[PDB]
């Protein structure tokens, strides 16, 4: 179709097939099998890489297990490495690294899989390429006897920042709770201290949620197992690269909560079979809306929302029921349910 | 054949909708 | 043995409980099973001592009628089955057989099932709870659902125009009463020519009118 | 199953009666008679209802233990000689018992120094037998993860009768199974997360040490131990990273797909990524506009690791 | 003639005559064979009607 | 089995014996085909069943 | 048999040997008596596999058997291949009554 | 009479092979004992369903959870846990 921006011709000494690797101006990478004796072009491969036109380069003998393989890195809006393993063609991205051009690199120090390159920021840098996603290892798994007293309970994400993630663990014996906060890809320190976590005492979280009642602050709501609902305030320091947690108040609830989410501006909990919508007040949480559910809904274990209008409610034994928000009525109205008994975990 | 309104003095937590709408008329 | 009102207080749907449910060996187990969500009741001709489908309604059963897509093959004209040849002529047709008694187009036969009607479905398919009972008339019901869809307020068909003595271009004879009483309550948004819609729209069979995202993984 | 050494295969079950009014657990022995081609129930004992684990030991007459009440197992008739023993696990103690009913040797499980009052009682969950050259030792494991060593001894003082001893061995993670290899390796199949390959550094407590050893001679003595934070009898050779149980997850990135989780046992953040991994060793500043790069082996110093690197700018070219 | 052979009291004869309607229909087509089979469904006898019902599913 | 059995539950403990013979003959076919698969669909609640397994109500 | 209601199957735990059909019964499912699409071979129990009877057909019980018996596809979809030994033990009144009227 | 005699004879063989068949005079005590014993087998038997129950009970090992589900088939097990 479009004008070629780069092209490279490679023979794999393993198979003996000739491959023609072509990059285009619209960010599309193509690959060709060249017939040897005649020269016919077979087995057409195509993948859209990015916005920039595709630049190619070639890496002679890189190791897969960390058997020889050759790979062609593909340069565009992002980088892609394009290899063949066990006669399966693979094209995957590279871990957080834009490259303008790329070449192999060998020392006594860096014996295998070394690579030197010019980054898009403009710096020249030496590296290793390590874990190629084959079909038996699609994911690269990054991290005396090593046993913790704390058990992980829930992982949360901030509403406005997609990159920040909050972690909550429970102590196995002492009714404590620790909280970690990893912004972007690194953990933050607690206040001005040395540690990377804050331990809350006399709390174990059944469920939790991070909710922005207003658009400039973020709040952690914990549901404790003692029928309490606790509000904290998350204060990330940004330059000291630290967070803080800070109690606001404690609110009493009738029943345990297993599902809670942000519904437009408030906190939407399910306690037992009751759907309760809460607003932030400065002495306690304030319940703005209370809806009772149909009779066969016994516990709610899961809910989800579609653009602050519809509500999908999941019962422990029955199934899904769908509700619509009545703004004038200030309640949720049920309008569909299911024919069989489904024991919902997540919806 | 128990909702809440926040009294501006903040201690209105233990009240009601219907109590707060009466105090719209007293206020 | 519990009484009937005693048993009705234990359940959320006391209209499901009847008098013979108190003769159960376990009325409390029986009554809670019946009021479980999505449990369908026992077919109701258990009480009767006649015979399932032995009533008078079966006298009026019509012959089978082909789905309308299959009528396009034209088999009904070539073999007539609704109401000949002597025994000598049948005997003579075995030693001298006639060929091509059916003139069916083979490309039309295949394309009925696979091209024209790959997405064909019958108009009535009983839903989850709809259990069949003896005097049920499914023919009336598909006629009634089709009667609701095509037929609309704001048009009157030619068949009724012959009966009413109301030809086209003409205000229907309750026009004056809706000038005296008013517009229909059940149609807030009905615009009628001559009351709240222009009189030059009073045109043919129409005099009035109601004037008030793709799914995940949809096929391209 | 019992190791019967080509005689008649035998096996032992723990069984409860599904219809009976009171909870009662039976210990049952079954012998396949190959001469008659059928399974016979040999023995049937009532045991304490907290029975939850059974393990078969080796033929004890090989190790000079006298398995009959007779002081010498020299009667040499076939019925008297075959008498297998098994280990039964209970709440807070163990038994070794006889097929022929002669013995019932009770030893209590050693109890930990700081016990959490939430979970009351200790039970056996897995075990393994390894034959030594003139001896054997049985590795038992509790639901707290403590590894215990059991030994059965000839008891020269009394009548040459069997004698059972337990000691603390090490503490590992709770396991479904244990396998010992002939090279002296131990494989533990964990119930949660990572798998482990160990090796035997020491063989544990010697039988003479009276202070650290419970015996079946006095079957009511208790022994408090403290678990060791470091492994004294074993060392780790390998782990296998397992994500089981994964209870909660978020998606960090969409291009390429990366997910964040926690490791349930050691409480670390785990990130699974569909990218090819890059490790930045060193980075250096460069003049501003650069486009392309070449690496060509240095022809000057032959048989040497020297290399030429060419960087090109739109006006200029650099050689290095 | 195979149609007259279906009245046989032998089960091999009826079973292999029904196989033969398949081979004849693969050569000369379904619809000459369908008409003779459909008209054979009007007899009183059950053996004849059950063997022509087998043969129609073979032709199909 | 879960959607089919919605037609069957009501007749298992009906007052009439003829209702109850016909419905247990269907239950027994279903049970031979699905002993393990019927388990999520039994109409048993804690009010209905004295010995109801409390492990079914646990949330992880 | 699907047709004669006085015939009695064994239904014991199946063994390792295979049940045979005669030339008159060849190609039939033992359960539903269907002539088409065979899926899995038939295994008979130990007692049905001993002696002079083991050579006989497992459907009609008198003639000598030559080929193997198969469950059809639809009996394997229903699980009826796992119920037990599908061998008929008695002869049945249809067989018996012809034998004594004739001589 | 012979078609009715088969279905009587086959009801006994299927009731011995598979425990939980019934007919028309099954007590609720008999029926509910069947439903409980089938459900406890499933919770014990599928290994995801073992881990779900063992974690949320907060048990000390997964094998302690398997013996709790298998002893619960016994009618005298509620009284055993109550006599501790
Ligand atoms: Mg409810
Ligand atoms: Zn048999
Ligand atoms: Zn035969
Ligand atoms: Zn079959």
Count of residues making up chain C: 220
Q: Which residues contact A290 (CB under 8 A, 6 or more apart)?
A: A274, A275, A276, A277, A331, B2, B3
The SS3 call for residue A7 is strand
Burial of C135 (0-12, 13-18, 19+ CB in 10 A): exposed
Min Cα–Cα distance to chain H from D81, Å: 34
Q: Which residues contact A217 (CB under 8 A, 6 or more apart)?
A: A233
| Encoded tokens for A171 | 């102590």
Residue with tokens 């029926």: H31
Nearest to A275 by CA among A307, A306, A300: A300
CA G77 to centroid of ligand 4, rounded, Å = 9
CA–centroid distance for D248 within its chain = 28
CA F14 to centroid of ligand 1, rounded, Å = 28
Check: CB of residue D240 under 8 Å from CB of residue D231.
no
CA distance G50 to G19: 11
F13/C36 touch (CB, cutoff 8 Å), yes or no: no
Domain ranges of chain G: 1-98
CA distance D25 to D17: 7
Ligand nearest the Cα atom of residue G74: 4
CA distance A21 to A3: 14
Phi, psi dihedral angles at F57 (to 5 degrees): -90, 0
Q: Within 13 Å and on the Cβ side, how many CA atoms surround E8?
A: 15
Nearest to H48 by CA among F55, A340, D244: D244
CA distance A112 to A62: 7
| Encoded tokens for D208 | 């003479």
Count of residues making up chain A: 347
Residue E43 at interface with chain C, using a CB cutoff of 8 Å: no
Min Cα–Cα distance to chain G from F54, Å: 33
Q: After which residues are there C–N gaps above 2.5 Å in chain B?
A: 1
Give contacts of A138 with chain D, Cβ < 8 Å: 274
Residue F41 at interface with chain A, using a CB cutoff of 8 Å: yes
CA distance B2 to B18: 9
Residues facing A199 on adjacent strands: A178
CA A298 to centroid of ligand 1, rounded, Å = 5
Check: CB of residue A78 under 8 Å from CB of residue A93.
yes
CA–centroid distance for E30 within its chain = 12
CA distance D151 to D137: 5
Nearest to C141 by CA among C120, C160, C123, C159: C123
CA distance D16 to D36: 28
CA distance G21 to G35: 13
Deposited experimental method: cryo-EM
H or E element: which one contains D32?
Answer: strand D25-33
Residue A249 at interface with chain B, using a CB cutoff of 8 Å: no
Three-state DSSP string of chain F = CCCHHHHCHHHHCCCCHHHHHHHHHHHHHHHHHCCCCCHHHCCCCCCCCCCCCHHHHCCC
Residue H48 at interface with chain D, using a CB cutoff of 8 Å: no
Check: CB of residue A283 under 8 Å from CB of residue B15.
no
Residue with tokens 């080929």: G67
Give contacts of F6 with chain A, Cβ < 8 Å: 339-340
Chain A to chain F Cβ contacts (< 8 Å): 18
3-state helix vs strand vs coil in chain B, percent to 5: 35, 0, 65
Residue with tokens 């290095």: D320
Ligand nearest the Cα atom of residue A295: 1
Ligand nearest the Cα atom of residue G22: 3
CA distance D233 to D228: 10
Determine how β-strand A41-48 pairs with β-strand C208-210: unpaired
Q: What is the DSSP letter of D109?
A: P
Residues facing A180 on adjacent strands: A167
| Encoded tokens for H7 | 């279905």
Triad A274, A276, A281: Cα angle to 5°: 150
Burial of D102 (0-12, 13-18, 19+ CB in 10 A): middle
CA A344 to centroid of ligand 1, rounded, Å = 15
Determine how β-strand D111-112 pairs with β-strand D224-225: parallel
CA distance D154 to D157: 9
The SS3 call for residue D190 is strand
3-state helix vs strand vs coil in chain D, percent to 5: 0, 45, 50
Give contacts of B3 with chain A, Cβ < 8 Å: 287-290
CA G26 to centroid of ligand 3, rounded, Å = 7
Q: What is the DSSP letter of A79?
A: -
Check: CB of residue A117 under 8 Å from CB of residue A125.
yes
Check: CB of residue D63 under 8 Å from CB of residue D85.
no
DSSP letter for each residue of A119-169 = ETTS-EEEEEE-----SS--SEEE------SEEEEEEEE-SS-SS-EEEEE
CA distance C27 to C3: 10
Residue F14 at interface with chain C, using a CB cutoff of 8 Å: yes
Give contacts of B11 with chain A, Cβ < 8 Å: 283
Min Cα–Cα distance to chain G from F4, Å: 16
| Encoded tokens for D168 | 């603390």
Q: Which residues contact A71 (CB under 8 A, 6 or more apart)?
A: A58, A59, A62, A81, A82, A83
CA distance A278 to D160: 77
D abuts B (3+ Cβ pairs < 8 Å): no
Nearest to D94 by CA among D77, D109, D114: D109
The SS3 call for residue D251 is strand
CA distance C199 to F38: 67
Q: Within 13 Å and on the Cβ side, how many CA atoms surround A221?
A: 27
Using only C-alpha atoms, what is the Rg of chain D? 30
Determine how β-strand A165-171 pairs with β-strand A150-157: antiparallel
Burial of G44 (0-12, 13-18, 19+ CB in 10 A): buried
In chain B, what is the straight-line distance between the N-terminal and C-terminal CA atoms, in Å?
38
Min Cα–Cα distance to chain C from E11, Å: 25
CA distance C126 to A26: 53
DSSP letter for each residue of A169-235 = EEESSSSEEEEEEEETTEEPEETTSS-S-EEEES--EEEEEEE-SSTT--EEEEEETTTEEEEEEE-
Check: CB of residue D98 under 8 Å from CB of residue D104.
yes
CA distance D102 to A2: 91
CA distance D141 to G103: 78
H or E element: which one contains C162?
Answer: helix C158-164
Nearest to C33 by CA among H39, H33, F15: F15
The SS3 call for residue G59 is coil
Q: Which chains touch A (3 or more CB pairs under 8 A)?
A: B, C, D, F
Q: Distances in Å between the alpha carbon of D279 and those of A70, A126, D103, D282?
A: 19, 9, 65, 9
DSSP letter for each residue of D123-181 = -EEEEEEEE-SS-EEEEEEETT-EEEEEEEE--TTTTS--EEEEEEEEE---EEEEEE-
CA G87 to centroid of ligand 3, rounded, Å = 11
| Encoded tokens for F8 | 């069957």
For residue D230, the tally of other CB atoms under 10 A from its CB is 8
| Encoded tokens for A10 | 């490679």
CA-nearest residue to C45 within chain F is: F19
Dihedral (C-alpha) D213, D218, D220, D221: value to the nearest 10 degrees? -40
Residue G78 at interface with chain F, using a CB cutoff of 8 Å: yes
H or E element: which one contains D95?
Answer: strand D93-98
Min Cα–Cα distance to chain A from F2, Å: 6
Dihedral (C-alpha) H7, H8, H13, H17: value to the nearest 10 degrees? 80
Give contacts of F28 with chain H, Cβ < 8 Å: 11, 14, 21-23
H or E element: which one contains A326?
Answer: strand A320-326
Q: What is the DSSP letter of D211?
A: T
This structure's resolution (Å) is 2.5
List the single best residue of C78, C91, C93, C94 to mutate versus E (max E Cβ within 10 A). Answer: C94
CA-nearest residue to C19 within chain F is: F15
Min Cα–Cα distance to chain C from E15, Å: 22
H abuts G (3+ Cβ pairs < 8 Å): yes
CA distance D280 to A114: 10
Q: Which residues contact H7 (CB under 8 A, 6 or more apart)?
A: F25
Check: CB of residue A299 under 8 Å from CB of residue A272.
yes
Ligand nearest the Cα atom of residue A298: 1
| Encoded tokens for C83 | 């109401």
List the single best residue of F30, F32, F35, F36 to mutate versus G (max G Cβ within 10 A). Answer: F32
Rounded to the nearest 10 degrees, the angle between the axes of helix H2-17 and helix F17-33 is 50
| Encoded tokens for D92 | 């807070």
Triad A209, A212, A218: Cα angle to 5°: 80
Chain D to chain H Cβ contacts (< 8 Å): 51
Burial of A165 (0-12, 13-18, 19+ CB in 10 A): buried
CA-nearest residue to F18 within chain H is: H24
| Encoded tokens for A187 | 């953990």
Chain A to chain B Cβ contacts (< 8 Å): 21
CA distance A158 to A150: 23
Burial of D317 (0-12, 13-18, 19+ CB in 10 A): exposed
Residue C186 at interface with chain A, using a CB cutoff of 8 Å: no
Residues facing A105 on adjacent strands: A114
CA distance D26 to D41: 12
CA distance C33 to F5: 12
H or E element: which one contains D317?
Answer: strand D317-319
Burial of A303 (0-12, 13-18, 19+ CB in 10 A): buried
Q: Which residues of F touch H (CB under 8 A)?
A: 12-13, 17, 20-21, 24-25, 27-28, 31-32, 35-36, 38-39, 42, 44, 49-53, 55-56, 58-60
Q: Within 13 Å and on the Cβ side, how many CA atoms surround D78?
A: 3
CA C36 to centroid of ligand 1, rounded, Å = 14
The SS3 call for residue C96 is coil
Q: Which residues contact G32 (CB under 8 A, 6 or more apart)?
A: G2, G72, G74, G75, G80
H60/D143 touch (CB, cutoff 8 Å), yes or no: yes
Which of A299, A317, A339 is facing F3, going by the closest CB pair?
A: A339
Phi, psi dihedral angles at A317 (to 5 degrees): -120, -25
Nearest to A148 by CA among D177, D141, D173, H56: D173
Check: CB of residue F3 under 8 Å from CB of residue A339.
yes
């Amino acid at each position: 179709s479009e004008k070629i921006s780069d092209m490279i011709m490679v023979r794999d000494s393993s198979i003996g097939q000739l491959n023609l690797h072509v990059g285009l101006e619209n960010g599309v990478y193509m690959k060709f099998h060249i017939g040897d004796v005649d020269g016919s072009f077979t087995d057409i491969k195509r993948r859209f890489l990015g916005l920039k036109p595709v630049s190619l380069s070639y890496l002679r003998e890189i190791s897969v297990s960390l058997k020889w393989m050759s790979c062609v890195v593909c340069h565009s809006s992002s980088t892609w490495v394009s290899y063949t393993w066990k006669n399966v063609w693979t094209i995957r991205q590279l871990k957080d690294q834009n490259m303008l051009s790329c070449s192999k690199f060998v020392n006594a120090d860096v014996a295998i899989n070394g690579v030197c390159s010019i980054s898009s920021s403009g710096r020249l840098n030496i590296g290793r390429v390590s874990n190629f996603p084959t079909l038996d290892n699609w994911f690269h798994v990054h991290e005396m006897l090593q046993i913790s007293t704390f058990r992980p309970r829930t992982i949360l994400s901030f509403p406005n920042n997609p990159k920040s993630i909050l972690f909550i663990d429970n102590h196995s014996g002492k009714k404590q709770c620790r909280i970690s906060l990893q912004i972007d890809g690194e953990c933050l320190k607690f206040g001005s201290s040395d540690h990377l976590y804050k331990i809350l005492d006399d709390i174990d979280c059944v469920s939790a949620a991070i909710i922005d009642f207003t658009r400039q602050a973020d709040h952690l709501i914990i549901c404790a197992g003692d029928k309490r609902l606790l509000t904290y305030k998350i204060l990330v320091n940004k330059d000291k690269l630290s967070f803080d947690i800070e109690l606001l108040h404690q609110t009493e609830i009738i029943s345990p909560i297993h599902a809670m989410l942000k519904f437009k501006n408030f906190l939407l909990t399910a306690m037992g079979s009751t759907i309760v919508l809460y607003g932030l007040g400065k002495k306690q949480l304030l319940r703005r809306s209370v809806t009772q559910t149909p009779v066969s809904i016994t516990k709610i274990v899961s809910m989800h929302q579609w653009n602050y209008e519809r509500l999908a409610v999941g019962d422990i034994h029955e199934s899904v029921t769908l509700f619509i928000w009545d703004p004038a009525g200030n309640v949720f109205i049920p309008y569909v349910d299911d024919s069989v008994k489904r024991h919902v975990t997540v919806l | 054949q128990e909702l809440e309104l926040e009294e501006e003095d903040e201690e209105g937590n233990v009240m009601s909708k219907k109590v707060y709408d009466e105090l719209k008329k007293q206020g | 043995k519990p009484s009937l009102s005693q048993l009705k207080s234990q359940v959320p749907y006391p209209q499901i409980i009847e008098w013979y449910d108190c003769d159960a060996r376990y009325p409390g187990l029986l009554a809670s099973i019946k009021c479980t969500k999505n449990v369908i009741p026992v077919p109701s001709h258990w009480q009767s001592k006649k015979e399932y489908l032995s009533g008078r309604s079966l006298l009026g059963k019509r012959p089978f009628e082909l789905p309308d897509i299959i009528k396009k093959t034209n088999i009904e004209q070539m073999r007539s089955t609704l109401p000949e040849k002597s025994l000598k002529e049948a005997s003579r047709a075995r030693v001298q057989p006639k060929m091509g008694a059916l003139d069916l187009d083979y490309k039309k036969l295949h394309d009925v099932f696979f091209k024209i009607g790959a997405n064909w479905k019958p108009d009535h398919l009983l839903c989850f709870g709809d259990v069949y009972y003896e005097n049920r008339n499914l023919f009336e019901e598909t006629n009634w659902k089709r009667m609701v869809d095509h037929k609309r307020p704001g048009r009157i068909s030619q068949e009724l125009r012959a009966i009413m003595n109301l030809p086209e271009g003409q205000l229907p004879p309750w026009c004056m009463k809706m000038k005296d009483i008013g517009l229909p309550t059940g149609y807030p948004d009905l615009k009628i020519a001559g009351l709240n819609w222009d009189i030059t729209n009073l045109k043919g069979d129409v005099y009035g009118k109601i004037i008030p995202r793709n799914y995940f993984g949809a096929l391209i | 199953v019992v190791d019967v050494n080509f005689n008649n295969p035998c096996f032992v079950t723990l069984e409860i009666d599904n219809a009976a009014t009171q909870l009662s657990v039976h210990l049952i022995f079954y012998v396949l008679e190959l001469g008659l081609n059928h399974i016979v129930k040999k023995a049937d004992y009532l045991v304490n209802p907290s029975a939850n684990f059974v393990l078969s030991l080796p033929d004890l007459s090989r190790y000079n233990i006298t398995t009959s009440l007779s002081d010498n197992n020299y009667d040499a008739d076939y019925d008297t000689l075959f008498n297998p023993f098994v280990v039964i696990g209970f709440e807070n103690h163990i038994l070794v018992k006889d097929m022929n009913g002669f013995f019932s040797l009770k030893v209590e499980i050693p109890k930990r120094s700081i016990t959490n009052s939430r979970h009351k009682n200790v039970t056996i969950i897995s075990g393994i037998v390894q034959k030594l050259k003139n001896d054997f030792f049985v590795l038992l494991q509790s639901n707290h993860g403590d590894l215990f060593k059991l030994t059965v001894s000839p008891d020269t003082n009394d009548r040459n009768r069997p004698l059972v001893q337990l000691s603390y061995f090490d503490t590992i993670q709770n396991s479904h199974q244990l396998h010992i290899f002939k090279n002296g390796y131990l494989f533990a199949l964990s119930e949660m997360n990572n798998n482990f390959l160990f090796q035997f550094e020491k063989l544990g407590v010697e039988k003479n040490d009276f202070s650290n050893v419970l015996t079946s001679k006095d079957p009511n003595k208790s022994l408090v131990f403290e678990p060791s934070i470091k492994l004294q009898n074993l060392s780790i050779l390998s782990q296998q990273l397992n994500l089981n149980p994964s209870i909660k997850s978020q998606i960090v990135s969409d291009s390429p797909l990366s997910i964040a989780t926690k490791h349930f046992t050691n409480n670390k953040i785990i990130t699974l990524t569909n990218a090819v991994n890059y490790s930045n060793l060193i980075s250096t500043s460069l003049p501003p506009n650069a486009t392309k790069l070449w690496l060509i082996p240095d022809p000057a110093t032959t048989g040497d690791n020297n290399t030429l690197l060419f960087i090109t700018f739109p006006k200029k070219t650099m050689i290095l | 003639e195979l149609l007259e052979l279906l009245k046989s009291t032998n089960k091999e004869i009826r079973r292999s005559a029904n196989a033969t309607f398949g081979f004849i229909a693969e050569a000369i087509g379904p619809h000459d064979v369908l008409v003779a089979l459909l008209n054979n469904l009007k007899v009183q006898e059950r053996q004849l009607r059950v063997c022509t019902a087998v043969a129609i599913g073979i032709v199909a | 089995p879960g959607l089919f059995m919605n037609y069957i539950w009501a007749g298992l403990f009906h007052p009439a014996k003829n209702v109850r013979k016909a419905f247990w003959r269907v239950y027994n076919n279903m049970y031979v085909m699905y002993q393990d698969a019927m388990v999520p669909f039994y109409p048993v609640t804690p009010d209905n069943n004295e010995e109801y397994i409390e492990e079914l109500d646990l949330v992880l | 048999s699907r047709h004669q209601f006085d015939l009695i199957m064994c239904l014991k735990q199946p063994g390792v040997q295979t049940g045979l059909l005669c030339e008159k019964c060849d190609g039939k499912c033992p359960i539903c008596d269907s002539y088409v699409r065979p899926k899995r071979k038939v295994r008979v129990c130990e007692n049905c596999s001993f002696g002079k009877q083991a050579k006989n057909c497992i459907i009609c019980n008198l003639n000598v058997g030559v080929n193997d018996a198969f469950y059809c596809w639809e009996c394997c979809r229903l699980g009826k291949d796992k119920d037990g030994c599908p061998r008929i033990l008695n002869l049945g009144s249809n067989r018996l009554d012809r034998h004594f009227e004739k001589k | 009479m012979a078609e009715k005699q088969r279905q009587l004879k086959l009801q006994k063989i299927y009731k011995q092979k598979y425990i939980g068949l019934g007919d028309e005079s099954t007590t609720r005590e008999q029926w509910q004992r069947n439903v409980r014993n089938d459900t406890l087998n499933t919770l014990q038997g599928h290994s995801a369903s073992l881990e779900y129950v063992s974690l949320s009970r907060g048990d000390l090992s997964i094998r302690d959870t398997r013996i709790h589900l298998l002893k619960s088939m016994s009618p005298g097990y509620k009284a055993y846990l109550r006599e501790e």
